[PDB]
Amino acid sequence: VLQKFKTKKRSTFLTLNYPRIEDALPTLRDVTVGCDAIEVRVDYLKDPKSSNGISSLDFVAEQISLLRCSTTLPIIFTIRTISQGGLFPNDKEEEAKELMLSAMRYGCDFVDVELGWSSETINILYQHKGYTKLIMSWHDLSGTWSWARPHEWMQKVELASSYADVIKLVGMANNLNDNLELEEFRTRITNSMDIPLILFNMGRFGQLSRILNKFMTPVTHPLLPSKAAPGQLTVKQLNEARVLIGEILPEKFFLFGKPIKHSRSPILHSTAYELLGLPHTYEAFETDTVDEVQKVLNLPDFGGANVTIPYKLSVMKFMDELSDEARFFGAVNTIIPIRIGDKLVLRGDNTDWRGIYDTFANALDGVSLRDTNGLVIGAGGTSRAAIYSLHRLGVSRIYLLNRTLANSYRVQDVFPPDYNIHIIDSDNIPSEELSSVTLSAVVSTIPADIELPEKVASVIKALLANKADGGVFLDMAYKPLHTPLMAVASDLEWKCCNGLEALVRQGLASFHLWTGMTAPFDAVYQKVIE
Template identity: 35%
Template sequence: MNVRDLINEISISRGQSSSSNHMLSIPPSRAPSPPANAPTFSRRASIVLIGMRGVGKTTLGTIASKALGWELLDTDIIFEQQEHVSIAQFISTYGWEEFRKVETELLERLIPTNLTEKVIACGGGIIELERNCAILQRFRHHGPVIHVLREKDAVLAYLRDSPQYPPFLHETARETWDRREQLFRECCSFEFVSLTVPIPPAPQGFRDIITPDQTFALKPVEEDFFRLLKFIHGVDTKKVALPPRGPRSYSLSLTFEDVRQAIPVLDELSTGIDLWELRADLLSSCELTFLAFQIATLRHHSSLPILFTLRTVSQGGRYTNVSPQDEKAVKNQSLLFHHALRLGVEYIDLEVVMPESTFLSVVEKKGNTVVMGSYNDWEGTLNWSSPQTRYLFERITQLHVDIVRIIGAAKSFEDNMALRQFVSSVERSSVPLVAINVGPEGKISRVLNPILSPLSHPLLPRAAAPGQISFYETQSILYLTGLLPAKKYYVFGCPIGHSMSPAIHNTAFAHLGLPHSYSIKETATVAELQSVMLDPTFGGASITIPYKVEIMPYLQHISRHARIVGAVNTVTPIPGGRGLSGDNTDWRAITTCLSRSLTPANVVTSSTNALVLGAGGSCRAALYALHQIGVINIHIYNRTRLRAELLAEEFRKLDPLLKIHVLDKLDDGPLPIRPPPTMIISTIPATATAPTYSSTTSTSSELIDVGLRLEHLSDAGGVAIELGYERRITKLLSLAQEKRDQGIAWAVVEGIEILLEQGYEQFRIWTGRRAPAKKVQEKVFEVYEQQRRLMQTPEVR
């Protein structure tokens, strides 16, 4: 369909004339009403979990209830407590019909009286009766009803071998599964695939639902589930920041028939991009469950948001064109898009040539999903200089989309210039525009397009469209055309001869094709750095000791976080030549490592205790990180009590709820902390060259012993973080590892991990891009091991 046909079709569907001679004089049609029925829930609304028996509803419910501090209500458990008999025995005695009757009565009492701050896990057959379906469908207007899925064969094998569940009536478990799947989807508001992860068995006699070691193994499941919950409630919808506030952004169209084929190279494929485009029309199947597992797999292996696209043949894809007169085809296409919304995709692409009923119904139900209204001209009829193209843009914006995407076809280089002139003519629109030309002649349009520009990658089976180029090529062209000037970055400090920071940033620059450089700048005074920071080529700097505080008077802006921490480790020029800005990424690195290492069993609550060793500058970053993740009970141990007291007093002013206690000693008996700390952060050097905390003399190769003992670490598991990285394994980390060897879920975070994380955050601040973590980590560990063999002096960054 060409532009003229599209505009005529839209006009006719609105009851307007199709004459092109007076089309532009026709007043804009009445736009559809803004979305009104999209699911919006209070963050306190209870969460209801439904799904087949054995998919893990109780496990997910336990994870969610502990993390949220809500009560878990499991209908199967409540049923057995109420009837004083197991479900299997009840059914054996009274039959399935009586069981369903009692189960329904239970649900009718449970839902209305537990509308807030509960996690309700329902039995696998709850949807067998229409009365129950009606209850769930009513509730989903109040709170989320989430259909939980797992791999069918794994669950069926578990059910077959488990004596806990009675046999199904008149059908096999597989037949029951296939029949119920549609019923679950008719009753739910969202769908979650709980991908199977290896779970260690519980010790004999363990009575709790989940052991501490099992919660550690379930961390990936927790992360996947809470990604969906955060999206549902708008806490973190993973929206890409668009220009002018954000940097240039890019998407990558996956062209695999099965996303699982991409897993080995997913890290490489994600280089430089901000968004995955899942081309559902290129997958081997569009069956709903297959799509659910495709999206779940992609999410499980990447934190990037997902754009769901179903490109039809007329728009350059493989999905069959849908005629508005073909009711079955319209229904099937609509099901796919609404299923994508049910899966919580962050972005969805809607072709403006699709049946209007489907387009408007998706927009109406979009919730927190960003809708991209797209038109793809594969016939080469679109003329960027034509008034019809402007009319097309305005028509699409009237459909209440969040982003417009118009794709043309370049026959000459001049077509790209016409495209840029068109973009300039609509830049004041409140709706962002993605505009590119396909084909070899259109490559430059992809480079110049600043919003979610579609890219390809050599590791893809094929490009999604002709003329697509890689992120690396895009950056090279931007540099050659002067749109990406080379910048110089530094690490400032003294002494810093063995800093690891150049390995971090130069590796990242090279892998992303960025023309920047990073080098060491060692000076006797901070004043000597001023001329470097005022140079037009200055891109930013890492600040290390002794200048983290001394640099602050030279900065025109200091972030709130850096002011609280009392130190700056990152300097960036303010755009427009308005001076320099200072920030601190140390606390962010600690926060990141804490968050990803805490298991569902050790989620932060009002009773959580943390222990910080040392009271120097790094301690401030640790205290702030703990405060930011919600810890209010913090204990400090330092050789000099007065210094710790002063620091504690200062941070107590940050939050009236914050309780910071200073300990006198560690080595005699149990810690005076109840419950024991589940987070321990050491901010002191791992080794020493002179007598210090230990009662005996230390050398540079000896580990410092502050008196921490194995019994001081909680038997509920926890996280041990070492900020120093002159040694890979320290006293604290060896104790945590010993706990792990005992089967207790203690996570170990080495100092070099903190170093990497703060470097990744610096890289993001400077470039607006994610650092290629895997490549950087490989290089840093290589350099780190080389330096350890060549030197004995602890490295300082």
């Protein structure tokens, strides 16, 4: 989790500072865009039952879990005190310690531990850390601790190094020169030590240093009630700034295939750049052979490319590496360039399955699919991704339905014997086993412009009746937009998703693999459908 962040070029995290996590939930998917983690500023939370001024353990815990049910992002648990720029009283160390211990007990990924707390308390928190990583932090609100002559900073590093998984040092900038002295300091300390370091100056004058701090920079978003500290930037602003100073360079992205004339992938990715402050372009590049794409892959400014029909298999030729999924499904839709130095390495990945997986992940709310029953309909390439996706989400019985047994068997035999696949024969229908089968997830991968034979439709109708609360139906076709089966399902009260949603989320996964950043589904979807 930290190792992920360390080998990543640039990480950021959101300073979530609502008074209640309930207030965050409606727009949470928009405000976390581009972030690798979420800091819950515990000092900003307001407990309705308090009367001593401190959030109770029960409350803070209800809040933290409420958030964990709405996002998979790692969490940073931060109690920031008054003299470090937050709201938590400095005199109340025992109450802070109690809170931080609790956070480690329910598996927060990180805890911010201020170097103003007693060494007794710091040690006790260190002794109980478990898997939680400690961020040892100090903030110089005075702006008097020089980075060029850093006696007081080095005392703090000394104290922190006994305990730290990460060290966070934040100055207050009086002028440009303070940001420059800070970079000198960054170079010197980083040579002499290998605990990872968050390092910048707050203040409007400090903004350069935030931009240059690559590892775990805090960011905010316009919908949050306030900045956590002076000079703080949004993700959009942060990228915009990094582009303007020459840190992030413009990159050309592409779509290979034929016909691609009418692909809406360029609008999808164009929109994503615009919402994240990135300077990239994305272009359809239709070719008659696959071999004509090789000169594109070698452009000095090539940032990646999607691959659609008929080149998902024939392009694999040019890859040096494959992701597990690309190898397993024997197909590439996402080409990722990696400059290890002056060597180009091309990595093929496949996000087609992510269209399925990520759609369910978002459509489910609280509902976990661990130990539930699913149904996949169809036997093409997409059905295989659907089976993998349902399995990966924890479905313990994956029902598989087709016109013929041989079709279902071909698909089944890709996976091992204990992959929870249970084939249904539409001829010899085992009605009594199926009567008691309550489904939580369904995926149709078959064509929508053809009405089915009424011996298969009959079975689909019957199974869809038996439905778990919050159960989700997904149709992978978008032609028509509202399909025959979707109607059947919707009348039976299923939460329904369409193939355009999945297509959009495939693209977004590709975008994340390229830029290191997520993009918001809603606004990107609104421009694709236009």
